[PDB]
Amino acid sequence: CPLMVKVLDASRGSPAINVAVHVFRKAADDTWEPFASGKTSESGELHGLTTEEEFVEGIYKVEIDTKSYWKALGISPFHEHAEVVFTANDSGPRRYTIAALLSPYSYSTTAVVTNP
Template identity: 35%
Template sequence: MSLSTHVLDAARGRPAADLAVRLDERDAAGTWTPLAERRTDADGRIRDWGRTPGAGTFRLTFDTAGLSDFYPEVTVAFRITDPGQHHHVPLLLSPFAYSTYRGS
């Protein structure tokens, strides 16, 4: 599985650099297990998680406390059914809203 993310700070109109992000995996019992923690680069991206898990349910938790007074963190859960594909999970953050989608 190839996984990347990109965080854009819409209030400032630039990438969110040096933002902490954690990748977790959910097991069959519904328990979340941390897999990796990274910080976004100068372009607001994380390209390498250091692991290549297979199919399953995962979540990215973004530590957004420094970017949003309302959302101290944003968690995006997603399912991977084809680990051979690249999965890009971007986050667009503003002070009182955020959006995400499956990118390419």
């Protein structure tokens, strides 16, 4: 699994469950091409977005749908979503974990990059 996303709820002390995550890859014409999407599990984790074969070099955007998450809990959040944009695999394949921590008016994201 070369790309994993894990989301926690800092406000409620739980995994952020059923969070929609959309991944895009910058195309030759500078537009964002859809790449992969999924939802976090009961543990707040999203595995299986992509494969070693599919996850080529490129600029990737990971958009976490924080707004729908809060609205489903009956909460009016500040942000529309949380975006993480990065260049991947520039010096050969790496494994990326994008960790996100959510509160209605704040979020943090961190990347863990490991050499497989």
